Protein backbone atom coordinates (compact mmCIF):
# COMPACT_ATOMS: atom_id res chain seq x y z
CA UNK A 1 0.00 0.00 0.00
CA UNK A 2 0.72 3.80 -0.64
CA UNK A 3 0.61 6.85 1.14
CA UNK A 4 0.94 10.55 0.42
CA UNK A 5 1.66 13.41 3.17
CA UNK A 6 2.11 16.08 0.19
CA UNK A 7 -0.17 18.11 -1.44
CA UNK A 8 -2.64 16.05 -3.28
CA UNK A 9 -3.99 18.55 -5.13
CA UNK A 10 -1.98 20.71 -7.71
CA UNK A 11 -2.93 23.30 -10.18
CA UNK A 12 -0.54 24.36 -12.93
CA UNK A 13 -0.66 27.06 -15.31
CA UNK A 14 -0.51 27.22 -19.58
CA UNK A 15 -0.12 31.01 -20.71
CA UNK A 16 -1.37 30.79 -24.64
CA UNK A 17 0.18 33.17 -26.64
CA UNK A 18 -1.81 34.87 -29.43
CA UNK A 19 -0.80 32.66 -32.19
CA UNK A 20 -2.53 32.62 -36.03
CA UNK A 21 -3.14 28.92 -36.41
CA UNK A 22 -6.71 27.19 -34.95
CA UNK A 23 -4.71 24.88 -32.73
CA UNK A 24 -1.42 24.29 -30.11
CA UNK A 25 0.28 22.37 -28.22
CA UNK A 26 1.80 21.75 -25.04
CA UNK A 27 4.15 19.45 -23.35
CA UNK A 28 4.04 19.42 -19.94
CA UNK A 29 4.93 17.08 -16.53
CA UNK A 30 3.19 17.10 -13.47
CA UNK A 31 5.19 15.77 -10.49
CA UNK A 32 3.43 13.93 -7.84
CA UNK A 33 5.30 13.95 -4.17
CA UNK A 34 5.77 12.58 -1.34
CA UNK A 35 5.05 9.14 -1.56
CA UNK A 36 5.51 6.25 0.92
CA UNK A 37 5.40 2.47 -0.21
CA UNK A 38 6.11 -0.75 1.35
CA UNK A 39 5.16 -3.40 -1.00
CA UNK A 40 7.24 -4.35 -4.13
CA UNK A 41 4.62 -4.42 -6.21
CA UNK A 42 2.89 -1.19 -5.11
CA UNK A 43 2.39 1.19 -8.38
CA UNK A 44 0.69 5.00 -8.85
CA UNK A 45 -2.04 4.62 -11.82
CA UNK A 46 -2.64 7.41 -13.74
CA UNK A 47 -5.66 8.61 -15.91
CA UNK A 48 -6.52 11.12 -18.27
CA UNK A 49 -9.91 12.61 -17.27
CA UNK A 50 -10.43 15.29 -19.51
CA UNK A 51 -9.88 13.40 -23.35
CA UNK A 52 -12.56 15.25 -24.73
CA UNK A 53 -12.81 19.30 -25.83
CA UNK A 54 -13.94 21.27 -22.74
CA UNK A 55 -13.94 24.93 -23.37
CA UNK A 56 -13.07 27.75 -21.40
CA UNK A 57 -13.96 31.99 -21.79
CA UNK A 58 -14.56 34.13 -22.95
CA UNK A 59 -11.43 35.47 -22.57
CA UNK A 60 -10.86 39.56 -22.52
CA UNK A 61 -12.29 39.97 -26.30
CA UNK A 62 -15.53 37.68 -26.25
CA UNK A 63 -12.71 34.49 -27.73
CA UNK A 64 -13.10 30.82 -26.18
CA UNK A 65 -10.38 28.37 -26.03
CA UNK A 66 -10.90 24.66 -26.34
CA UNK A 67 -8.79 22.41 -24.13
CA UNK A 68 -8.14 18.60 -23.58
CA UNK A 69 -5.82 16.58 -22.63
CA UNK A 70 -4.32 14.96 -26.14
CA UNK A 71 -2.18 12.07 -24.69
CA UNK A 72 -0.75 11.02 -21.50
CA UNK A 73 3.29 9.46 -21.40
CA UNK A 74 2.64 6.89 -19.13
CA UNK A 75 -0.58 4.68 -17.50
CA UNK A 76 1.19 3.39 -14.65
CA UNK A 77 4.41 3.14 -12.92
CA UNK A 78 5.58 0.75 -10.11
CA UNK A 79 6.78 2.47 -6.88
CA UNK A 80 7.95 -0.47 -5.33
CA UNK A 81 9.22 -0.42 -1.88
CA UNK A 82 9.96 3.25 -1.13
CA UNK A 83 9.82 5.74 1.60
CA UNK A 84 10.25 8.64 -0.01
CA UNK A 85 9.04 8.41 -4.03
CA UNK A 86 7.72 10.61 -6.76
CA UNK A 87 6.23 10.04 -9.63
CA UNK A 88 6.74 12.18 -13.08
CA UNK A 89 3.79 11.65 -15.74
CA UNK A 90 4.48 13.61 -18.82
CA UNK A 91 1.40 14.85 -21.02
CA UNK A 92 0.47 17.07 -23.90
CA UNK A 93 -2.21 19.85 -23.82
CA UNK A 94 -3.99 20.60 -27.21
CA UNK A 95 -5.99 23.97 -27.02
CA UNK A 96 -7.95 25.13 -29.84
CA UNK A 97 -9.75 28.09 -30.57
CA UNK A 98 -13.69 27.71 -29.60
CA UNK A 99 -16.68 29.43 -30.03
CA UNK A 100 -16.73 33.05 -29.03
CA UNK A 101 -18.67 34.64 -26.47
CA UNK A 102 -19.33 38.37 -26.44
CA UNK A 103 -21.85 38.83 -24.05
CA UNK A 104 -20.47 36.27 -20.94
CA UNK A 105 -18.60 38.10 -17.99
CA UNK A 106 -14.74 37.67 -19.34
CA UNK A 107 -11.97 37.03 -17.42
CA UNK A 108 -7.72 36.36 -18.19
CA UNK A 109 -7.81 33.30 -16.90
CA UNK A 110 -9.71 30.34 -16.74
CA UNK A 111 -9.78 27.44 -14.23
CA UNK A 112 -10.23 23.67 -15.44
CA UNK A 113 -10.11 21.01 -12.65
CA UNK A 114 -10.58 18.04 -14.86
CA UNK A 115 -7.34 16.81 -16.28
CA UNK A 116 -5.14 14.37 -15.36
CA UNK A 117 -5.47 11.96 -11.69
CA UNK A 118 -3.14 9.43 -10.44
CA UNK A 119 -3.98 7.26 -7.84
CA UNK A 120 -2.05 5.38 -5.24
CA UNK A 121 -4.99 3.43 -3.17
CA UNK A 122 -4.52 0.36 -5.33
CA UNK A 123 -7.28 1.27 -7.76
CA UNK A 124 -6.98 -0.54 -11.22
CA UNK A 125 -7.53 1.69 -14.72
CA UNK A 126 -10.49 -0.36 -15.04
CA UNK A 127 -12.23 0.88 -11.87
CA UNK A 128 -10.85 4.81 -12.07
CA UNK A 129 -12.73 4.52 -15.68
CA UNK A 130 -15.94 2.82 -14.43
CA UNK A 131 -16.27 5.45 -11.73
CA UNK A 132 -15.56 8.43 -14.38
CA UNK A 133 -18.38 6.58 -16.62
CA UNK A 134 -20.51 6.79 -13.56
CA UNK A 135 -19.66 10.10 -13.03
CA UNK A 136 -20.42 11.23 -16.51
CA UNK A 137 -23.73 9.37 -16.70
CA UNK A 138 -25.15 11.31 -13.94
CA UNK A 139 -24.08 14.46 -15.82
CA UNK A 140 -21.55 15.96 -12.94
CA UNK A 141 -20.29 19.40 -14.38
CA UNK A 142 -16.24 18.38 -13.58
CA UNK A 143 -15.60 14.69 -12.17
CA UNK A 144 -12.04 14.89 -10.31
CA UNK A 145 -14.04 15.45 -6.96
CA UNK A 146 -16.53 12.68 -7.03
CA UNK A 147 -13.76 10.32 -8.66
CA UNK A 148 -11.44 11.13 -5.32
CA UNK A 149 -14.58 10.64 -3.44
CA UNK A 150 -15.33 7.32 -4.75
CA UNK A 151 -11.69 5.70 -5.31
CA UNK A 152 -9.57 4.12 -2.31
CA UNK A 153 -7.10 5.56 -1.20
CA UNK A 154 -4.99 8.88 -2.13
CA UNK A 155 -5.63 10.39 -5.48
CA UNK A 156 -3.33 13.26 -6.59
CA UNK A 157 -5.44 15.55 -8.97
CA UNK A 158 -4.30 18.24 -11.80
CA UNK A 159 -5.85 21.48 -11.92
CA UNK A 160 -4.78 23.97 -14.98
CA UNK A 161 -5.25 27.63 -15.07
CA UNK A 162 -5.33 29.26 -18.69
CA UNK A 163 -4.37 32.34 -19.34
CA UNK A 164 -4.75 33.83 -22.94
CA UNK A 165 -4.29 37.83 -23.32
CA UNK A 166 -5.28 38.35 -27.08
CA UNK A 167 -4.78 42.01 -27.83
Same mark, same amino acid.
Given at each position: ??? +? ?23 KSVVFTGISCDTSTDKIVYKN ?29 ? =? ?34 ? +? ?11 ? =? ?25 ? +?? +????? =? ?5
Amino acid at each position: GCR +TTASLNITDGINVGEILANETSFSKSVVFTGISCDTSTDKIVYKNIQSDWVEVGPFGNGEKLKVKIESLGKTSDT =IGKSSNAQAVLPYVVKIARGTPDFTGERKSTWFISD +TVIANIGGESSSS =IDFWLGICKALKFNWCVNYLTSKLAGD +TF +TLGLN =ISYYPK
